[PDB]
Design a protein around this motif. Structure first.
Motif, short mmCIF file in Angstrom:
data_model
loop_
_atom_site.label_atom_id
_atom_site.label_comp_id
_atom_site.label_asym_id
_atom_site.label_seq_id
_atom_site.Cartn_x
_atom_site.Cartn_y
_atom_site.Cartn_z
N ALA A 139 0.82 -1.20 0.00
CA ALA A 139 0.00 0.00 0.00
C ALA A 139 0.86 1.25 0.00
CB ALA A 139 -0.93 0.03 1.21
N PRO A 178 1.63 8.35 4.70
CA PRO A 178 1.66 6.93 4.31
C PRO A 178 3.06 6.38 4.07
CG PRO A 178 -0.04 8.12 3.13
CD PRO A 178 0.84 9.14 3.74
N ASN A 182 5.00 3.34 6.11
CA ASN A 182 5.64 2.17 5.53
C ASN A 182 7.10 2.06 5.97
OD1 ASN A 182 3.69 0.75 4.19
ND2 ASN A 182 4.10 1.64 2.17
N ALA A 227 -1.57 -1.26 4.09
CA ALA A 227 -1.68 -0.26 5.14
C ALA A 227 -1.49 -0.93 6.50
CB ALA A 227 -3.02 0.46 5.08
N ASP A 228 -2.59 -1.26 7.17
CA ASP A 228 -2.53 -1.97 8.44
C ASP A 228 -3.24 -3.31 8.43
OD1 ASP A 228 -5.08 -1.06 8.28
OD2 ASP A 228 -4.94 0.33 9.98
#
Ligand SMILES: Nc1ncnc2c1ncn2[C@@H]1O[C@H](COP(=O)(O)OP(=O)(O)OP(=O)(O)O)[C@@H](O)[C@H]1O
Ligand SMILES: Nc1ncnc2c1ncn2[C@@H]1O[C@H](COP(=O)(O)OP(=O)(O)OP(=O)(O)O)[C@@H](O)[C@H]1O
Lengths: 370, 150, 150, 370
Positions: free
Chosen positions: A79, A166, A170, A195-196
RNA sequence: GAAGCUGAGGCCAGUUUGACUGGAGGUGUUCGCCAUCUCCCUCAGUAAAAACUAG
DNA sequence: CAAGACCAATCTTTACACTCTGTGAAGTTTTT
DNA sequence: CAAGACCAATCTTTACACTCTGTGAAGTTTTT
RNA sequence: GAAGCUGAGGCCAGUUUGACUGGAGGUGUUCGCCAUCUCCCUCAGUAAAAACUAG
């Protein structure tokens, strides 16, 4: 060759003109004040939006363009990365027979800022940007982070919607991506993260993913830098799982190949829109009832043309929605053509829906000229 | 056909590379230093580990990944036709049946088995070799007879 | 002295063999096929893995053990005398101090340090290499600089 | 070349004459009846002793001599094996910095007989010894196992004190020895086992052995074939542990060597006996008060000489005890000389105590002639 | 339900008008009777395997 | 209370037929 | 509630001195 | 203490003398609204990154 940033790198290509005044007068780069950040509420979630006129937004954008895009990441992070997509997150698991899905609670709020400093330290040279007062790394994190006014106790916070948040997430989670990937590899499990949302799949005939031991181990790892697992979204299934509507199935055993297909809940809205289009429902009703897009009277720029303005706006919004869903399924078709992992009968259904969408958009465009 | 796809992740010069839709002749062209022989080395190591030879594991493209994966999708439609048939009762055929296509037709029921038999047969065998950071190697199929037979 | 002991467990032809009390000349005699060169292979592999070379792990004596261990006890009394002294302030000496004998004199207190200094100095460094069944190798000291310096 | 047993192997070298009658008349080899087994109580523990006159005892002895001694074992098993000793169990841990000790509750009673059958099956050829009624493996396990009359529910049981029970226990637990050894090796822990007492040691600076995760993992492994961990005897310490009086210490850090020394509690009894000998306490009092050996009046074989008999018996018992403890410390000295891991000052104390023991035994023997 | 625990008694001391609990101290400590220094009796019952007989 | 991780050994794995090609119609100590 | 397992990169590691030897006294979708 | 949850209201239906809960069915299922086949309105507020514009 890793990316290194020095004083000239910040002053010439990063700052350019955003903080020229601070660098010529040797004045400390200030914190992101609450005046530059507006607080939006979406659901129970809170978003922080920076104003474009502020130099912090521009320096965040050029940081994203030139600095954070060069730091190596972990391939399990699918992501917010150049070339990463949800279908890539859901693909490595077509080889698995049992599936499990975990979630990190408040991933962006639980990122410690000291971890961000430690993660970015090797890639930024240790110098003093402003005399002997503020270091270069301190100025860059001042640009990147923010202090939450609602919760002043936790101090500096990486907020949702800060352009660079973001990529920084990461980078700071690469450590745990490596740890969890190593653990899963030693257990023989395929691991991926968007993402999560974390997804694990076992290609062997075993109950490892359904056991409490796996959850306990992943939580024990996640406690290293203070994350937690959302227990409400934990899911574990066999031979078929559905993640936000995208169903991965694998009924086979040894050396079998699964298939990914969107379900009918996912296509319900587009099918209803096409049905309403075929039923000659007026465009305003279609846009308001299904696409939840409406023309607020406070948004009308001019009063010169209003009856035509509303019709044109709704026509354009319907065209845009149809084109967006057309490109969403074209993405599905391209992914299937590249990897050959989407259900064939579902490919036929996609082709039918895409032909219907194209015919409806052609009909609407033809009516536009009448 | 013979091989449906070959996928390499984080090994040698490949980040995530998938080769598929093979034809009878596959001409490989490219500039010097682009990995054309790296495909050879990857396939050679995969087949050396297939026969349980003792060789050094290949190097990772980047060390920020804890794994390196090689995936081979063998096309066993013709072998399934060869062995499933009642005429070929030889001992080699019996071994191929009892090793590969047994425990795979076991899970299927009568309806699905008959559907596979009557319709256009398309059967694949996917084998994945994962090299961890500590030079250990893990397969997705834990039966060495299967790998030797493949 | 140089080496206090060498211990091999479950590797090659050795079940549990310990060699110690080395002298200046050590003549090795024995019948053909008794492992005289197997000691050579074990030491050579241990030193190849000491410098982080990529080599195939040695075979286990019996497969009913999940581990195979090689232990080396280096005698660093003379090097401790060399480096601890205040006169030798060179960069090689400083490296040896900061790598080996630091973090070992750190844990000791003043009484024990003075007792070690005044009495007959006898310091040893024990390094164990364990080969697991899946060809992974684990050391008892996780600092590669220590192994390279040794 | 693994050991294989066929019909001739049982009939010629194993049975010899114990079950000649059953093999010539083709009659099934019977169960070990309760008439051949006497039930002793020691503590809360119950021991089962077979009578020597029964052919089952002789066939057990020749089974131990010729069959169970050839099956390969796991080197982590230091008990009941040719060349295995307690000091060997306590030695690999001199390299560790943190120590942990676990116990298996009722190890010999919790051994499933089906596991014994599965473990011994590959080493015994599958034939029919007696017609088509009883198989060879069935006859051998009939010789080896027993049915507990107190607890008939659990069925066949490997009892304590059945000659062959220790070797069979090692063979049946080789599977778990391999599993636990592999797990510890992957965790970087040194593992050893004596009977059912398991000892783990970490040579690194870490708290792994003191955590609940390690206990949970070992228990999860032990549940594969139904064992359990005795929670009362669980112990975890750092830099020094004491196991039944034998203290392993390692105060060092990187690349350090620990030392094993018996403590004063261990040497209390021998020191008290030597003290009583030096104080001219009569031999009867010394034997009864410290060595807990006494001449029961029901054990006297003849009434011809009784005053001399008691004195000679107590003299011989004191000589035997002193010689036994002398050889126990000689074993300690030999182990130190072979491995160089016993405390040097404790070696001096051992030498002093051994000289005292030898002088006292010499004095007693000289008095014997007076 | 699961877990864990120890042979049977008799004076003497400590807690009890009438029966139950211990029979060197010092020192340190992870407080474990764990480590180190110095200096109660009786009567039953007591399987097995391995190591060890300084030099 | 209950659970992923349940040794390593152990046995001809190279073709068939109608179809010349297709696969089918009387010691100490330890465990105890 | 709380815990073992807390990336991979990143910098001259080869001798000293008195002692010739010893070291020291305006899109969809997803996360959300 | 720790964990988790959803924009603000108004008719109509179901539970309530007076306010709260849902607005295709069939089929199967790991029972998850999970999968597959066929066929309510209003008003606010709506940050960011990536993928995707069949062939
Ligand atoms: N162990 C390795 N780790 C990382 N990259 C490697 C490794 N070995 C080779 N490479 C990379 O792979 C390439 C090696 O060239 P390769 O032989 O794969 O290409 P090629 O096209 O076959 O060359 P040529 O055209 O000369 O035959 C180079 O880019 C090199 O950097
Ligand atoms: N990989 C291995 N696994 C098990 N045992 C092995 C292995 N390699 C060698 N051996 C054993 O070790 C011995 C090999 O002989 P080795 O060279 O070690 O002895 P040697 O005394 O040096 O011989 P020589 O006297 O001819 O020089 C043989 O007993 C052989 O069985």
């Amino acid at each position: 060759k890793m990316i290194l940033v020095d004083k000239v790198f910040y002053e010439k290509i990063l700052s350019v003109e955003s903080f020229k005044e601070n660098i010529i007068t040797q004045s400390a780069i200030p914190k992101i004040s609450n005046k530059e950040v507006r607080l939006i509420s979406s659901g129970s979630k809170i978003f922080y939006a920076i104003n474009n006129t502020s130099p912090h937004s521009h320096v965040q954008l050029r940081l994203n363009r030139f600095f954070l895009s060069h730091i190596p990441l972990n391939s399990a992070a699918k992501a917010f990365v150049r070339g990463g997509s949800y279908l890539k997150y859901l693909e490595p698991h077509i080889y698995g027979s049992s599936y499990c899905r975990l979630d990190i609670s408040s991933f962006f709020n639980n990122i410690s800022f000291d971890d961000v400093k430690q993660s970015l330290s090797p890639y930024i040279k240790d110098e003093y940007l402003i005399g002997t007062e503020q270091k270069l790394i301190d100025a860059i994190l001042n640009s990147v982070g923010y202090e939450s006014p609602i919760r002043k106790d936790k101090g500096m916070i990486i907020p949702m919607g800060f352009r660079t948040s973001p990529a920084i997430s990461n980078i700071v989670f690469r450590k745990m991506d490596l740890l969890i990937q190593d653990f899963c590899a030693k257990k023989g499990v395929i691991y991926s993260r968007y993402a999560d949302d974390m997804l694990f799949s076992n290609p062997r005939e075993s109950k490892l993913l359904m056991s409490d031991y796996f959850i306990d181990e992943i939580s024990s790892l996640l406690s290293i830098m203070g994350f937690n697992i959302n227990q409400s979204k934990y899911i574990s299934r066999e031979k078929e799982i559905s993640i936000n509507g995208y169903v991965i199935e694998n009924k086979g055993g040894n050396g079998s190949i699964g298939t990914i297909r969107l379900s009918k809940s996912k296509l319900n809205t587009v099918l209803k829109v096409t049905h309403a289009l075929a039923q000659n429902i007026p465009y305003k009703n279609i846009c308001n009832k299904y696409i939840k897009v409406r023309l607020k009277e406070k948004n009308i720029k001019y009063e010169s043309k209003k009856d035509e303005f509303e019709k044109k706006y709704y026509r354009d919004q319907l065209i845009n929605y149809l084109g967006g869903y057309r490109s969403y399924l074209i993405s599905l078709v391209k992914f299937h053509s590249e990897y050959k992992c989407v259900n064939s009968d579902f490919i036929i259904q996609i082709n039918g829906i895409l032909n219907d969408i194209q015919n409806h958009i052609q009909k609407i465009k033809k009516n536009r000229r009448l | 056909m013979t091989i449906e796809s070959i996928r390499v992740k984080n090994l040698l010069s490949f980040d995530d590379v998938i080769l598929r839709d093979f034809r009878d002749i596959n001409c490989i062209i490219g500039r010097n230093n682009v990995g054309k022989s790296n495909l050879l080395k990857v396939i050679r190591y995969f087949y050396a580990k297939l026969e349980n030879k003792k060789v050094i594991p290949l190097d990772f493209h980047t060390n920020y990944n804890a794994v390196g994966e090689i995936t081979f999708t063998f096309d066993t439609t013709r072998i399934k036709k060869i062995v499933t048939s009642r005429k070929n009762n030889g001992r080699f055929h019996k071994h191929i049946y009892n090793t590969l296509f047994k425990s795979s037709s076991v899970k299927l029921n009568f309806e699905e088995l008959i559907a596979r038999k009557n319709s256009t047969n398309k059967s694949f065998f996917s084998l994945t070799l994962t090299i961890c950071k500590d030079d250990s190697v893990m397969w997705s199929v834990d039966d060495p007879k299967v790998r030797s037979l493949l």
